[PDB]
Amino acid sequence: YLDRKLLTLEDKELGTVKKGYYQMKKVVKTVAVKILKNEANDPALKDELLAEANVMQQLDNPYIVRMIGICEAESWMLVMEMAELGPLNKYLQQNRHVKDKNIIELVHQVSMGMKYLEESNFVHRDLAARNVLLVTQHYAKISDFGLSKALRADENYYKAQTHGKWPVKWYAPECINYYKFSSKSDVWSFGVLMWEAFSYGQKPYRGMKGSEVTAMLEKGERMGCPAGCPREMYDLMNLCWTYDVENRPGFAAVELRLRNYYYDV
Numbered sequence: 058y059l060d061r062k063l064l065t066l067e068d069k070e071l072g073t074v075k076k077g078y079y080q081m082k083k084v085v086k087t088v089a090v091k092i093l094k095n096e097a098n099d100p101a102l103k104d105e106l107l108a109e110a111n112v113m114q115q116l117d118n119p120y121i122v123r124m125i126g127i128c129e130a131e132s133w134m135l136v137m138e139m140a141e142l143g144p145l146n147k148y149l150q151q152n153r154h155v156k157d158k159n160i161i162e163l164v165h166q167v168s169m170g171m172k173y174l175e176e177s178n179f180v181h182r183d184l185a186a187r188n189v190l191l192v193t194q195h196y197a198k199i200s201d202f203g204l205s206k207a208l209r210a211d212e213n214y215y216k217a218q219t220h221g222k223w224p225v226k227w228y229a230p231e232c233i234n235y236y237k238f239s240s241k242s243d244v245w246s247f248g249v250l251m252w253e254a255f256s257y258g259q260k261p262y263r264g265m266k267g268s269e270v271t272a273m274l275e276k277g278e279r280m281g282c283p284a285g286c287p288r289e290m291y292d293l294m295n296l297c298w299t300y301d302v303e304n305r306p307g308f309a310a311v312e313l314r315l316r317n318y319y320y321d322v
């Protein structure tokens with residue numbers, strides 16, 4: 058737990074999200090803070106942020122947002138190291154001259170964070186461009202672990218009871234049809250994230266209902282190649298969107314395909 062006296066929040070909002078400065082043992086660290094009311098809150102939304110904190114305290118990777126801690130004071134606060142450029146989708150909407158090599162670099166960093174998550178046997182379950190936060194224009198981090206789950210030792214998937222309120226346009230068919238979430242389900246989501254990144258933050262499956270996306274995908278249809286997208290990156294999207302989970306690659310295989318140097322498998 059953090060000391061409220063060492064935290065300063067900027068009033069201008071960044072639910073309530075603020076930028077702040079947290080005094081560490083020597084230096085100040087710039088932080089982003091999710092703030093909830095102490096009494097008139099939503100207990101389920103608080104449970105989700107406590108669940109996020111429980112996951113993020115177990116993770117340690119350069120391509121995943123680091124948690125500073127929780128502060129219990131005039132409000133309930135979840136404090137993270139700030140990736141100040143913010144969400145990747147908004148960034149690419151506002152910066153349309155980011156070069157192909159730079160977009161590949163960023164999505165490669167996300168694949169390295171997700172290869173670590175997969176090795177760690179956690180599923181993310183909300184992997185979208187809005188949840189990739191930029192430290193700089195050359196350094197991406199994965200965020201938003203509110204739906205994340207630690208997999209059981211004897212299974213490679215998390216089974217949800219039924220469909221909740223989900224980011225269905227980012228979900229694999231086995232998630233929608235059987236409520237089963239694996240690291241290969243996150244690979245499907247990563248394919249959608251790549252499409253967003255090469256479409257300068259446009260929303261996927263524009264104008265379609267979730268049920269219409271399910272029917273489209275079952276028929277073997279997929280979103281088309283974004284204008285100007287490198288062919289090799291659209292081909293990797295299609296491999297991420299392999300319907301059968303058993304033939305879809307995992308993140309170790311996807312991460313290799315985003316490297317810009319020679320390597321062996």
Ligand SMILES: Cn1ncc2cc(Nc3nccc(N(CCCO)c4cccc5[nH]ncc45)n3)ccc21
Pocket residue numbers: 071074089090091109122135136137138139140141142143144190200201202
């Ligand atoms: C303009 N804008 N909008 C959102 C946003 C976010 C950041 N950077 C950032 N960096 C680290 C964490 C973080 N937040 C706020 C996300 C708001 O949607 C978090 C706080 C608490 C828990 C969290 N989990 N995942 C992220 C996150 N935000 C910069 C500019 C931004």
